[PDB]
Design a protein around this ligand. Sequence first.
Ligand SMILES: CO[C@H]1O[C@H](CS(=O)(=O)O)[C@@H](O)[C@H](O)[C@H]1O
Length: 382
Amino acid sequence: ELKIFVSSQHQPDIWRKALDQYEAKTPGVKVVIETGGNTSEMQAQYLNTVMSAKDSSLDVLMLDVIRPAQFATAGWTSDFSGKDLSAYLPTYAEANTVNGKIVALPAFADSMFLYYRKDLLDKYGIKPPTTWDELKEASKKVMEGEKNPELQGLSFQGKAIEGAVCTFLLPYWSEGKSLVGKLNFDNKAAVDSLKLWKSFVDDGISKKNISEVATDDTRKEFQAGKVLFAVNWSYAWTHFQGKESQVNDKVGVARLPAVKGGEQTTCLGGWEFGVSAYSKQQDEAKKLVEYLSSQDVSKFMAINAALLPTYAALYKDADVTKTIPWFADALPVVETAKARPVTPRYNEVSETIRTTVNGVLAGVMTPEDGAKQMESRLRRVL
Ligand SMILES: CO[C@H]1O[C@H](CS(=O)(=O)O)[C@@H](O)[C@H](O)[C@H]1O
């Protein structure tokens, strides 16, 4: 009788279909979904509480790509002994291996992309922007042409959530800088990043309360036809093309714009399945994770939920690209996407950066003071 922790955000109703396929072929085994918070840091704060207390209730954990160092060092997961991760993208083999131990099996890949209203860019003769400067010029042109009070130029995540860590790093990496064995905090790129996110609000290109916007708020608002440009993850696509959308067939996907004279870098994301060290069904949990991390299930979740695959071959799979054409071009974006710090203290890293991003955008602290505070707090942790 297995229990799997899955975010309300990760389309548990589509995972439920994959569990039904498992139960149909595996007699005597039933799985039940326990849904968690929409955002990764909320899920993490929850799982820390129950893993700390050695709660045996949960069997399989859907964990963020940022979680293996913590969960490995805490002893919260049962390692996949003699497991070979070489069927999967090297980036996810690397994320799920801590001190030589296979901590987890990849569930799905992810990276940030620029979603855009191809109907509005096409109306105004605009190319997908390759720089943030080009994105500001396109936004002002479209907003002034459309005279739609509800149309946002750019939605990005400014809420004090895990996605705001990603937000902070996008311009930092585009400028060619790295955060880390040791912290190498570049003040100029850190301030440039916080100033850039603030500039969209100050220019009216982003709404005044972007500090309140989480991943699925960007998703909901873009889907309701209210956003020209959206920073999001692959899952949003299935929602954009579903039965409750204002933007069916009106959505382009591009790589993120670069900073003035930078690269079109992005943030690595994605999720993996861990088996709780406290599960009393280790054997059946492991067999369930082997199924859910299999190629066929990787393919099903790409087609049915726009979850980017963990297997290189699936990005150009006939049925995958028939369903989502832009997956065919997505592999090199995923394989070159920059990783957030690997550390067991990642909760503290996240808390420092996301609270600094949110405070800058809420007008609590200047971009310069925000960077100053972040460097001091990260110094202590890394
Ligand atoms: C929904 O997952 C995606 O977004 C997360 C941010 S949040 O939406 O949870 O704040 C990232 O951490 C994940 O790596 C990425 O796959």
